[PDB]
């Protein structure tokens, strides 16, 4: 397979015109979103986004709501502090992004933990792999680093990532076992399209697959064709599966000299296919 993970992705945006900010947090197990929070929602709560989390009881929902509400407040202050460190105008909107989480090893222990920040899209501050020290991107982030050293923030993170994060992840994998722990292989085929030159486009499709990780390549006589190929970003189907394609222009009549190759964890071994009308 590959390692499973639990992650949270949060976005804070300042709104000077309104005297406030907006905080949006989403949680994922692997490629599957399962919770959301939006501080603009009336009566804002942590809310379910996958069916298998709805079995958690009231204490879970109250506790998670209290903790994400508190983060939204702290991140509103952090927006103001960072504006000051950079001597930016009070009228402009800025963005503070936060990502943290845990990957699970094959023995059930933490494989890798992370906790990191960006300001206006640029790296700001990050927890090192050791979970015992921080790396700052500039003179402003050094100020924040010294506060977190003084407060022993790393000890708290180390404890959360090795303990609560891994433990929660293992519970969610069990609650959603029938969907999360099952891979679905791609359905594949090659199409042919008349093209603006006397070249023909061949397009290799992979459809209906989970998880999202996949390789699609083209060869002619053992020779990889990546330098002239268009490969689109992997995209959601909307039902928990994904799609991708790879296309290239070939001379007319020569279509069957080309092979598409597909690798995915749902396949028993790698696939070779060609234009097969």
């Amino acid at each position: 397979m590959g390692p499973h993970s639990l992650s949270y992705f949060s976005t804070a945006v300042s709104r000077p015109d309104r005297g406030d900010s907006r905080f949006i947090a989403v949680g994922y197990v692997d490629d599957t979103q399962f919770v959301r929070f939006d501080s603009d929602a009336p009566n804002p709560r942590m809310e379910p986004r996958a069916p298998w989390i709805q079995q958690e009881g009231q204490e879970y929902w109250d506790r998670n709501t209290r903790n994400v509400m508190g983060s939204a407040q702290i991140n509103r202050v952090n927006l103001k502090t960072l504006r000051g460190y950079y001597n930016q105008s009070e009228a402009g909107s800025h963005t503070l992004q936060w990502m943290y989480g845990c990957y699970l090893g094959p023995d059930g222990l933490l494989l890798r933990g992370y906790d990191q920040f960006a300001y206006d899209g640029a790296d700001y501050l990050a927890l090192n792999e050791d979970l015992r020290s921080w790396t700052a991107a500039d003179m402003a982030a050094q100020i924040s680093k010294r506060k977190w050293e003084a407060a022993d923030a790393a000890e708290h993170w180390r404890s959360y990532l090795q303990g609560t994060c891994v433990e929660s992840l293992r519970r969610y994998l069990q609650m959603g076992k029938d969907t999360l722990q099952r891979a679905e292989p791609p359905k594949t085929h090659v199409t042919r399209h008349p093209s603006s030159d006397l070249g023909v486009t061949l397009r290799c499709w992979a459809l209906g697959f989970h998880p999202k990780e996949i390789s699609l390549t083209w060869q002619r006589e053992g020779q990889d064709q990546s330098q002239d190929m268009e490969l689109v970003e992997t995209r959601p189907s909307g039902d928990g599966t994904f799609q991708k394609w790879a296309a290239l222009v070939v001379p007319p009549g020569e279509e069957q000299s080309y092979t598409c190759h597909v690798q995915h964890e749902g396949l028993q071994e790698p696939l070779t296919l060609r234009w097969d009308p």
């Binding site: 998670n64 903790n67 994400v68 508190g70 983060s71 202050v77 501050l125 959360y160 609560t164 929660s168």
Partner: peptide
């Protein structure tokens, strides 16, 4: 499970 102590920058 969401973390429970967000730090001031």
């Amino acid at each position: 499970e969401f973390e429970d102590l967000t730090f001031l920058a």
